[PDB]
Amino acid sequence: IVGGYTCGANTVPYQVSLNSGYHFCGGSLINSQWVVSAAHCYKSGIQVRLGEDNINVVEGNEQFISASKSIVHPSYNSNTLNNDIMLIKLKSAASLNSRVASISLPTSCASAGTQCLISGWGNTKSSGTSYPDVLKCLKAPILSDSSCKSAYPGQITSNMFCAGYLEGGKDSCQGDSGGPVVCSGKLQGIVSWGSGCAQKNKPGVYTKVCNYVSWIKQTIASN
């Protein structure tokens, strides 16, 4: 997260870190055994780290739970990043508590200008890299489809939205992928991609979770 702020430990209790011996993506806990992340975060060897704040220190409240299923959307296209959503089933249910909590899925899509909280342990620099220890947060609005499509012509599918700040300086960034964009208490986005981070006129692009709620539910229900 570039231009964000330290969330505060466990203030984003649905935020998970996907760890493969290092944090590589975020995710969002959507029930005690399932995490939503980005399809492009798929890999083997995912350990979901819940309850994290400082991802480099065991502070307490962590739950590390291996992914037992990592379900990339069947129609994920790694070139276009359409359907950039993955469900991770935890090998065992997380113990939910105030610091490890699911986030609700949308019941409907969010509107342009809705303010959302985007969080993650991604790079905090728009140039170069600095990976934070603690979870960073960014309040960011959903942009209009027209602005999103203007920023990324031909690249924004119906399963994407832009959020953030065209003036630059505030965005999700590498390492935030897969993590949440929560708006009005609903997981409306998954950090997916963007041109750089926090670059002028290049807002973050996010998987539009509301398009996947049924798929999520159906996939969870069948797994």
Binding site: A38, C41, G122, S177, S192, W193
Partner: peptide, 8 residues
């Protein structure tokens, strides 16, 4: 680029 570590 995707926002994973590493970006893709």
């Amino acid at each position: 680029c995707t926002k994973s570590i590493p970006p893709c």
